[PDB]
Amino acid sequence: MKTINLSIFGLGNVGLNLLRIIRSFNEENRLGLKFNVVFVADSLHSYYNERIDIGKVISYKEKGSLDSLEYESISASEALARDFDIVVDATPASADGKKELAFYKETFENGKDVVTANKSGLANFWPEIMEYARSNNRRIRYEATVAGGVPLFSFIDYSVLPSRIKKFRGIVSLTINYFIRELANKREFDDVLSEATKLGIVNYKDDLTGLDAARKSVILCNHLYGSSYRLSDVFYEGILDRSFGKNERLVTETGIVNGKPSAESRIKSLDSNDYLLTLGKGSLGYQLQTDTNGTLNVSDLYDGPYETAGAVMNDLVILSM
Amino acid sequence: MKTINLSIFGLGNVGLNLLRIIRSFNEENRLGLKFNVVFVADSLHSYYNERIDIGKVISYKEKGSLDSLEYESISASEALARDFDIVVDATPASADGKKELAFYKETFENGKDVVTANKSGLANFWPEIMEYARSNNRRIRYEATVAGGVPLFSFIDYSVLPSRIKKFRGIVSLTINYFIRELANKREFDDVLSEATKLGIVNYKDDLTGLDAARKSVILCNHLYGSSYRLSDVFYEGILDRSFGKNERLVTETGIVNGKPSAESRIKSLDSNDYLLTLGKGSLGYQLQTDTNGTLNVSDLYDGPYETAGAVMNDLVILSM
Numbered sequence: 001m002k003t004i005n006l007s008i009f010g011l012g013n014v015g016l017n018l019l020r021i022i023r024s025f026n027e028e029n030r031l032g033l034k035f036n037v038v039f040v041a042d043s044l045h046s047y048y049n050e051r052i053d054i055g056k057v058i059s060y061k062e063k064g065s066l067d068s069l070e071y072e073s074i075s076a077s078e079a080l081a082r083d084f085d086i087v088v089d090a091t092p093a094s095a096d097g098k099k100e101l102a103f104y105k106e107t108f109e110n111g112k113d114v115v116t117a118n119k120s121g122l123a124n125f126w127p128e129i130m131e132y133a134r135s136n137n138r139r140i141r142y143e144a145t146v147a148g149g150v151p152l153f154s155f156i157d158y159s160v161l162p163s164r165i166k167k168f169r170g171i172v173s174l175t176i177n178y179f180i181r182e183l184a185n186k187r188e189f190d191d192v193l194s195e196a197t198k199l200g201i202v203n204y205k206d207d208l209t210g211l212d213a214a215r216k217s218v219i220l221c222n223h224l225y226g227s228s229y230r231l232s233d234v235f236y237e238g239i240l241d242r243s244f245g246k247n248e249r250l251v252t253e254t255g256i257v258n259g260k261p262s263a264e265s266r267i268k269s270l271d272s273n274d275y276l277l278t279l280g281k282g283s284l285g286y287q288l289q290t291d292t293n294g295t296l297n298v299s300d301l302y303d304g305p306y307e308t309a310g311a312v313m314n315d316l317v318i319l320s321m
Numbered sequence: 322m323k324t325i326n327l328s329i330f331g332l333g334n335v336g337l338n339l340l341r342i343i344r345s346f347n348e349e350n351r352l353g354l355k356f357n358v359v360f361v362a363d364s365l366h367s368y369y370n371e372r373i374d375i376g377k378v379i380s381y382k383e384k385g386s387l388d389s390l391e392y393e394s395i396s397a398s399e400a401l402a403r404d405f406d407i408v409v410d411a412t413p414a415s416a417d418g419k420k421e422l423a424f425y426k427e428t429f430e431n432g433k434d435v436v437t438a439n440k441s442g443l444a445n446f447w448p449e450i451m452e453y454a455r456s457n458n459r460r461i462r463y464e465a466t467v468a469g470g471v472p473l474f475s476f477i478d479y480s481v482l483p484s485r486i487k488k489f490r491g492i493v494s495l496t497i498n499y500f501i502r503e504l505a506n507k508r509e510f511d512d513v514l515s516e517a518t519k520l521g522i523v524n525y526k527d528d529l530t531g532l533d534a535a536r537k538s539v540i541l542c543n544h545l546y547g548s549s550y551r552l553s554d555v556f557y558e559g560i561l562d563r564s565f566g567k568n569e570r571l572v573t574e575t576g577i578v579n580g581k582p583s584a585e586s587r588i589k590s591l592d593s594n595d596y597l598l599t600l601g602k603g604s605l606g607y608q609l610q611t612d613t614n615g616t617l618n619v620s621d622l623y624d625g626p627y628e629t630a631g632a633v634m635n636d637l638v639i640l641s642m
């Protein structure tokens with residue numbers, strides 16, 4: 001009954017599952033919403049139509065066959081100037097966040113909101129993105145940038161409204177924690193890495209230096225405390241010679257320390273009854289300590305891109321409803 | 322900056338902590354909200370004022386000294402007819418739900434919304450309460466009726482919007498589970514009960530027959546599936562002669578079974594790695610399996626009335642923001 005129009009940038013693990021979800025949601029939902037797609041782009045294609053056939057785009061991407069499509073081809077900038085409501089950024093994260101910054105600037109100025117799974121602009125240029133949003137009276141949500149499909153920003157925004165002090169501890173970076181836990185099994189780094197490569201588990205540098213965790217901690221700290229931090233404002237460390245205990249994890253923590261928001265990702269030996277120790281190697285989870293709503297433990301069972309796309313979709317519904 | 326006016330019915334473990342929270346929230350919040358209280362009632366007092374002094378009401382209730390107050394005394398019905406926005410029901414749960422039904426009817430017809438921690442009207446007269454709300458274009462929220470201060474209805478309503486099949490399993494009834502676990506320690510019923518009484522842990526009939534769980538399951542199932550069930554539509558059981566295993570809990574489950582919403586509270590021996598087995602005796606928690614947002618585990622560490630009042634307060638903010 002209410003139609004919301006989208007331009008989707010990126011058709012990979014997240015983007016392609018988002019298309020599948022949008023299709024099912026359109027057919028099934030009890031929210032009175034319909035999401036129409038007017039534009040899809042990947043690294044090779046940039047297709048516009050008043051009513052993109054989503055099933056066709058899915059089927060042709062699955063067959064490696066978007067080459068075969070009839071649609072208008074227009075550049076990202078032209079697409080932002082066409083009539084629609086929301087941009088979805090499911091593209092690769094740049095090293096410096098500049099491309100994401102420029103893209104959100106142009107999106108906002110063209111009068112559209114942003115939902116992003118890409119953390120790069122937010123981790124490097126948060127106050128600039130927020131200024132461009134405010135300036136243009138637009139909004140951005142970023143559920144999927146931290147803790148994938150486990151509700152986190154919607155949880156903070158709608159479930160614990162009365163709490164003022166919130167403090168966060170979590171496993172939000174899985175690959176480095178996989179490596180730590182395997183090394184704690186008394187395996188050699190080279191053997192863990194070799195197998196992880198064959199399994200598709202891991203250029204693994206950003207993960208294993210703790211930088212992935214650091215980028216997420218910027219977004220989390222800024223959202224929680226209204227800080228305007230970038231990467232240099234947070235602490236992080238990684239694993240790139242020593243042995244690891246069974247109770248060691250790279251834990252990401254944010255809170256107010258000495259009157260100042262603080263964010264850190266550190267390798268710690270946890271107490272044997274710590275909630276975070278209970279999480280499986282594929283499980284994202286966190287403990288959120290609040291002053292009015294107690295201390296809450298939240299996690300999923302198995303992280304994956306379908307659930308991640310489901311977080312993007314929750315943001316899309318929040319913005320629309 | 323935006324002022325919302327409340328009438329608070331009940332000044333006990335929940336009600337009195339709600340007053341304390343409202344005071345701190347008014348002083349501290351970054352949401353641009355202020356909650357003003359125009360009316361408070363307990364079993365002895367029914368005080369109205371354009372601007373009730375909350376600190377005074379707290380201090381006089383703590384001293385057992387509301388007798389000493391100057392304010393207008395008016396009946397609940399007169400209070401509902403005065404100008405305000407929301408009624409908070411933090412009163413005792415009736416056996417049959419009729420008093421709660423009549424009270425919400427009069428609240429809605431007088432043009433005010435309801436936030437309730439009392440489960441009784443909802444467990445017995447859900448479709449009637451919902452019809453009276455719809456009829457009068459009013460709203461009711463009930464976060465605190467099931468799983469206390471652990472976000473549950475706000476979680477469903479704002480964090481997993483895209484998911485259609487949701488299925489729920491949880492420990493939502495703590496006292497019966499306390500008794501089960503103590504009995505699993507090879508103690509005698511009479512000794513558990515005697516100690517529990519001295520400790521203030523437990524007329525314990527509704528808890529130990531599983532009826533408390535059953536009432537909560539009605540509310541949960543109706544919220545999840547849009548059913549209009551009452552107590553006779555759900556299954557439940559209790560402990561009121563045999564021995565109990567270490568892995569037995571009274572688990573409350575809801576889901577679609579054979580195309581029909583189903584809700585059951587049953588004593589089950591859980592598999593040793595079940596999430597629900599990880600919860601402490603003071604911990605409410607649940608696992609929510611969804612088709613678009615994965616399977617989510619959520620719990621608190623220690624249930625209590627302050628956190629429960631914090632759930633009431635989250636409902637108040639949702640209704641107002």
Ligand SMILES: NC(=O)c1ccc[n+]([C@@H]2O[C@H](COP(=O)([O-])OP(=O)(O)OC[C@H]3O[C@@H](n4cnc5c(N)ncnc54)[C@H](O)[C@@H]3O)[C@@H](O)[C@H]2O)c1
Pocket residue numbers: 009010011012013014015041042043044089090091092093117118119144145148304305306308
């Ligand atoms: N579960 C996850 O995979 C997960 C979880 C959280 C966040 N993310 C983030 O979501 C984003 C997408 O991840 P993914 O796994 O889908 O990546 P992917 O590599 O599977 O897909 C990237 C997609 O973007 C496309 N693309 C590349 N350059 C483009 C351009 N200039 N314009 C439009 N499209 C372009 C690619 O062709 C591909 O379709 C990343 O920034 C990632 O960090 C992913």
Ligand SMILES: NC(=O)c1ccc[n+]([C@@H]2O[C@H](COP(=O)([O-])OP(=O)(O)OC[C@H]3O[C@@H](n4cnc5c(N)ncnc54)[C@H](O)[C@@H]3O)[C@@H](O)[C@H]2O)c1
Pocket residue numbers: 330331332333334335336362363364365410411412413414438439440465466469625626627629
């Ligand atoms: N943490 C918890 O204690 C908890 C958790 C979930 C739900 N609840 C529910 O919240 C409600 C309140 O629980 P509580 O622990 O605060 O109970 P309580 O017994 O501590 O307080 C009940 C309050 O209601 C007052 N009251 C009694 N009759 C009244 C009337 N006719 N009008 C106005 N006030 C009246 C009492 O004097 C008292 O102030 C109950 O329905 C309970 O089932 C409580």
